[PDB]
Amino acid sequence: SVPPSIAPFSFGDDPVNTGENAGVQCMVQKGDVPITIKWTLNSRPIINGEEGITILKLSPKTSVLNIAAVEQDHRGVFKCIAENKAGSSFTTSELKVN
Amino acid sequence: SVPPSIAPFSFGDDPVNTGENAGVQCMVQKGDVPITIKWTLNSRPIINGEEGITILKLSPKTSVLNIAAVEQDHRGVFKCIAENKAGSSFTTSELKVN
Secondary structure, eight states: OOOOOBOOOOSOSSOBOTTOOEEEEEEBOSOOSSOEEEEEETTEEEOTTGGGEEEEEEETTEEEEEESSOOGGGOEEEEEEEEETTEEEEEEEEEOBO | OOOOOBOOOOSOSSOBOTTOOEEEEEEBOSOOSSOEEEEEETTEEEOTTGGGEEEEEEETTEEEEEESSOOGGGOEEEEEEEEOSSOEEEEEEEEOBO
16 A cells, blocks of 8 residues: 655756757556556656657656757656556656756 | 767666666767667677667668666666768767666
């Protein structure tokens, strides 16, 4: 009956240049399975392929996000949301683009 | 003729507890494709699944390493090596376990 906890992630506090290969990982630490992991960008759900963003479920507790070529469209607050029977958690990181 | 360049990564400032979920993304920035991306732990090569370490080539310029459940055996220097026909490059991060 353990609720999900998530390790912090960050694109870095320095703005990113267009064309860079950037990414973060949503790694659930403690938490009962089954767990669902999902993403939003500026509160809109994003899934693999949307806006050129790669999102891949590496394991039941890890989601990998990769932006192969950063654009100004990718600017904003990325949120990972992890949910199971016992509770839910989210953590965020703002991507800044020069 | 452009050799691979790699964004630095880190498991973090602080030592990690046993059982935690840790990982890094090796994201090549500059460099002509195709690029071979491989990993070592304390100078010895790692393959997907070895010592419970997940390794996945996510894209032509990104490789993801995940340790689903960290043990003290995972202690040491993780190196990502990126190679093409032009040249090679690497970046590292030391994983510490309490």
